[PDB]
């Protein structure tokens, strides 16, 4: 390291929570893109969610959602051929897993693609709140959780990325290699620390968060 | 592999080159942001050039710059505590290298962060030109290259990224363990092929080019 890391100071008032894709279709073992390493993560985020809710901190769950017509997917239907039949509104599997059950004052954000703030309510709900801060968590790290953060600094929030609580998944060998979860986990950490904002634990920012409060 | 490869069809008309970052302050080993794999990527870019400028594909070039007094550093500053220093417009080393000169009929868009898309000129200019297809090259592949993808796909660009033509860097262990560029280029081009759009070699892209013009 030649640089320092960064870390953010918690004010509560400006800071949100963001739970990316916390969904049946990506949680349950049956669902059409179930991640395993979801499994470890939905207990650290039950804890932030109390934390948050109790510091009167802003939780905003992100939903992968589509009409399931194909009038809303172009790119996203060329990589992803059944994302109409499996994100569709109407099934079952897009609702938020119910160990993490939206509650009435949380937020709900829909999105069609990845990024949670590309074309969504995201921006306009964060800075109605005058939120600068935030804090993300679910799945896929490299993915919905990495294209949010990107998104994120590029709009001048102060991100901050948990180790313990964002999921990646195992790639097939398309050309360059078998890739586990464990490896896109260990350089997406490492490039968000080092190119767009805060890693730390969900225990950290959760007694950050109690003591700013 | 459970879903297939995408192939972009190229017509020469809607397609452009983005040549991202190939700046002196991250292609010399002077620099004060040296990536030494770049210098493997400078001849398949030549080629491809050389290539796109024959059949009449529009060559864009990125920089990353900004005015160098802090006016426009936010969170690129928290991260990069020097930038001002080092990107700043007056500075020599902003400048793309001579091995890629730009030519008058190219076009250069500036950038204060990484994304080639978000505020910057670059929606503008391909929309103008009627392009729906984008061939990325340059450097760093999973920082500027990689958010210039996900970018692109997610205003439904068909983004092409060329496998031997985007360079990664090394990081340091930041509590994750050690990084390798090789790890980092592996993991990128893996995600961006599952996820994102086309990889293919610069070859492949230049045969194509040449074929459809």
């Given at each position: 390291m030649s640089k320092p890391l960064?870390?953010?100071?918690?004010?509560?008032?400006?800071?949100?929570?963001?739970?990316?894709?916390?969904?049946?279709?990506?949680?349950?073992?049956?669902?059409?893109?179930?991640?395993?390493?979801?499994?470890?993560?939905?207990?650290?985020?039950?804890?932030?969610?109390?934390?948050?809710?109790?510091?009167?901190?802003?939780?905003?769950?992100?939903?992968?959602?589509?009409?399931?017509?194909?009038?809303d997917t172009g790119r996203m239907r060329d990589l992803y051929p059944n994302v109409d039949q499996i994100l569709a509104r109407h099934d079952p599997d897009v609702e938020v897993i119910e160990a993490l059950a939206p509650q009435s004052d949380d937020?709900?954000?829909?999105?069609?693609?990845?990024?949670?703030?590309?074309?969504?309510?995201?921006?306009?709900?964060?800075?109605?709140?005058?939120?600068?801060?935030?804090?993300v968590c679910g799945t896929v790290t490299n993915?919905?959780?990495?294209?949010?953060?990107?998104?994120?600094?590029?709009?001048?929030?102060?991100?901050?990325?948990?180790?313990?609580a964002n999921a990646a998944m195992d790639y097939p060998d398309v050309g360059f290699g078998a890739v586990s979860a464990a490896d896109v986990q260990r350089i997406s950490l490492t490039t968000i620390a080092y190119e767009f904002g805060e890693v730390t634990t969900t225990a950290e920012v959760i007694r950050r968060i109690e003591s700013a409060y």
């Open positions: 960064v870390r953010w100071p918690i004010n509560p008032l400006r800071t949100a929570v963001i739970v990316v894709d916390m969904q049946k279709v990506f949680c349950e073992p049956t669902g059409a893109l179930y991640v395993k390493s979801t499994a470890d993560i939905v207990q650290p985020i039950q804890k932030l969610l109390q934390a948050a809710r109790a510091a009167q901190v802003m939780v905003i769950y992100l939903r992968h959602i589509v009409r399931g017509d194909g009038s937020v709900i954000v829909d999105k069609l693609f990845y990024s949670g703030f590309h074309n969504t309510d995201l921006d306009t709900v964060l800075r109605a709140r005058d939120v600068d801060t935030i804090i993915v919905c959780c990495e294209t949010t953060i990107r998104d994120g600094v590029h709009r001048e929030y102060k991100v901050i990325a948990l180790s313990d």
